[PDB]
Amino acid sequence: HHWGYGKHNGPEHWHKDFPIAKGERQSPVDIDTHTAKYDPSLKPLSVSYDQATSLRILNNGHAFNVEFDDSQDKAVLKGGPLDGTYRLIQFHFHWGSLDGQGSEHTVDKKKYAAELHLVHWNTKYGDFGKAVQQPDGLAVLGIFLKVGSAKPGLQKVVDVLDSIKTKGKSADFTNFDPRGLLPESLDYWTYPGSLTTPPLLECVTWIVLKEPISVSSEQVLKFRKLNFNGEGEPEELMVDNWRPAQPLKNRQIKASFK
Ligand SMILES: COC(=O)c1ccc(SC)c(S(N)(=O)=O)c1
Ligand SMILES: COC(=O)c1ccc(SC)c(S(N)(=O)=O)c1
Ligand SMILES: [Zn+2]
């Protein structure tokens, strides 16, 4: 009876195995754009993905991960609210059963169809496993997806999903360039938070871009054909793999713009 997003093991149940679910810096959160403070001390984000080395795509049972070689400083996030250098380890998405839901963060209560998370770990801690034990261990760059015109740079991901339909399937996925998933503007909101799945560790500096990317209906429909179940099990479409907004508590959301 493991956690998930089904009818009986969803987000409202997670606190029973992971009491930090009710902690002081849980994510995601609603971003109330009127209350977020413009912070002129925040720096432009530095996204350096020119040398990124994608390796493999994995259906992890809850979403799919596009994994990167993070055994040296290839693809790094720096600047913005961050001190030091954060190495890209993987990205994944959260998405809905319908276009009107799917995102984890919300903006003035608006849900987007999906949300991309580029996960990076702080090099000062040497490895991801050590970094998630630290209050500044991870930096997750979040990008909203809306449904409209296709995102050409997403199509390579869409096209391999039929090869990783069920939990635990993987496929080679080299030479994928994550720059093609970025919006034009790197204006962002930032706040201290958590992983949004168990173990829900409070180790994330969240950076959420204001500008969504547009994907096509057909692209997001192909996300919705993935399965939470393993091969040869009854089908559980992989949809609504998002955690709802959690209490902001004693936190300030800062804007880089405004
Ligand atoms: C400390 O947390 C993790 O490393 C972690 C948490 C959740 C997941 S899947 C929901 C994974 S994954 N994508 O299976 O490597 C990794
Ligand atoms: C469905 O969410 C996931 O599968 C998922 C897997 C890994 C991570 S971080 C290693 C996350 S998150 N949203 O970054 O905490 C989420
Ligand atoms: Zn995520």
Solving technique for this entry? X-ray
Resolution in A: 1.4
Q: Which stretches does DSSP call E strand in 63-127? A: 64-68, 76-79, 86-95, 106-107, 114-122
Rounded to a whole number of angstroms, the distance between the first and last alpha carbons of the chain is 47
Handedness of CA 20, 23, 29, 31 (dihedral sign): negative
Closest CA relative to residue 119, chosen from 38, 203, 226: 203
Q: Kindly report the protein residue whose alpha carbon is nearest to atom 11 of ligand 1.
A: 60
Q: Which atom of ligand 1 is nearest to the CA of 132?
A: 1
The helix (run of H) or strand (run of E) holding residue 130 is helix 128-131
Q: Report the distance separating Cα 129 and Cα 124, nearest Å.
A: 12
Mutation to probe ligand 1, out of 5, 60, 104, 196 (largest number of atoms < 8 A from CB):
60
Residue list, ligand 1 pocket, CB within 6 Å: 60, 62, 65, 132, 195, 197, 199, 201
The catalytic position among 13, 62, 105, 120 is 62
Other CB atoms within 10 Å distance of the CB of residue 11: 18
- The CA 245 to ligand 2 mean position distance, Å, reads 15
The helix (run of H) or strand (run of E) holding residue 221 is helix 217-223
Residue list, ligand 2 pocket, CB within 6 Å: 60, 62-63, 92, 94, 117, 119, 140, 195-197, 241
Peptide bond connecting 135 to the previous residue in cis, omega within 30 degrees of 0: no
Closest CA relative to residue 73, chosen from 58, 89, 60: 89
Q: Are 47 and 200 in contact (CB under 8 A)?
A: no
The helix (run of H) or strand (run of E) holding residue 51 is none
62 is catalytic: yes
Q: Residue 122: which residues within 8 A CB-CB, separation 6 or more?
A: 84, 85, 86, 131, 134, 136, 137, 138, 139
Domains, the chain, ordered by start: 2-258 (3.10.200.10)
